[PDB]
Amino acid sequence: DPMYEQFLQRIQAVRTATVAKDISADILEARHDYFGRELCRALDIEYRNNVLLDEIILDVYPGVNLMEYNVPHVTPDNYIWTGDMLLILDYKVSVGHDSTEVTYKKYTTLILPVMQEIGINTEICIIRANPVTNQISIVGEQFKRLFPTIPVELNFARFFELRKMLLDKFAD
Ligand SMILES: COC(=O)/C(O)=C/C(=O)C1(Cc2ccc(Cl)cc2)CCN(Cc2cccc(OC)c2)CC1
Numbered sequence: 001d002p003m004y005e006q007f008l009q010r011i012q013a014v015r016t017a018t019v020a021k022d023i024s025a026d027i028l029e030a031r032h033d034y035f036g037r038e039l040c041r042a043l044d045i046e047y048r049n050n051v052l053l054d055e056i057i058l059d060v061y062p063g064v065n066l067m068e069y070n071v072p073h074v075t076p077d078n079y080i081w082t083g084d085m086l087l088i089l090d091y092k093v094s095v096g097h098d099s100t101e102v103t104y105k106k107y108t109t110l111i112l113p114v115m116q117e118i119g120i121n122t123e124i125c126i127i128r129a130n131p132v133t134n135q136i137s138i139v140g141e142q143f144k145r146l147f148p149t150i151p152v153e154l155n156f157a158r159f160f161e162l163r164k165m166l167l168d169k170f171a172d
């Protein structure tokens with residue numbers, strides 16, 4: 001399980017708050033990445049983790065006249081092209097929904113107008129794991145209809161363990 005040991009080694013060696021703050025942020029991103037990976041594996045969809053909208057548009061519509069559109073500089077985690085619809089996918093791992101709503105608002109305003117100009121039907125979908133209860137919440141109707149049952153086995157304990165080691169080490 002090489003992801004956990006790399007963090008252990010980093011926590012073993014860290015001696016300053018500055019590097020420690022960095023390790024903490026990394027664990028949280030890694031915890032998000034693990035959810036994204038596990039979720040795509042269970043739902044049997046291609047795993048990606050940050051894709052420029054430019055490359056999404058160029059995948060689903062290789063003949064777009066790109067220079068005619070002002071495409072924003074955003075990287076949603078992943079996407080699904082259904083054949084008829086594009087689902088923008090962002091993963092979230094939080095005990096609450098404030099972070100989910102912030103991304104939802106952002107991608108709604110910056111992504112939907114350009115995709116309407118090009119004529120690709122698009123839905124913003126945000127999938128969030130509660131890392132304590134492992135409950136999964138979904139924002140996005142077409143996603144909901146494509147994946148009615150969503151019981152993805154998850155275990156976030158190792159990430160909580162790594163971070164507790166850190167805050168114990170720096171508890172002063
Ligand atoms: C969970 O949902 C997100 O928050 C998300 O997926 C964020 C990201 O992917 C970034 C890496 C990261 C992921 C999870 C966590 Cl826990 C912490 C960090 C990378 C990109 N970044 C937005 C950004 C910033 C600066 C330039 C830029 O160029 C478009 C884009 C946010 C963090």
Ligand SMILES: [Mn+2]
Nearest residue numbers: 049050076077
């Ligand atoms: Mn991301």
Ligand SMILES: [Mn+2]
Nearest residue numbers: 077090091092
């Ligand atoms: Mn994300």
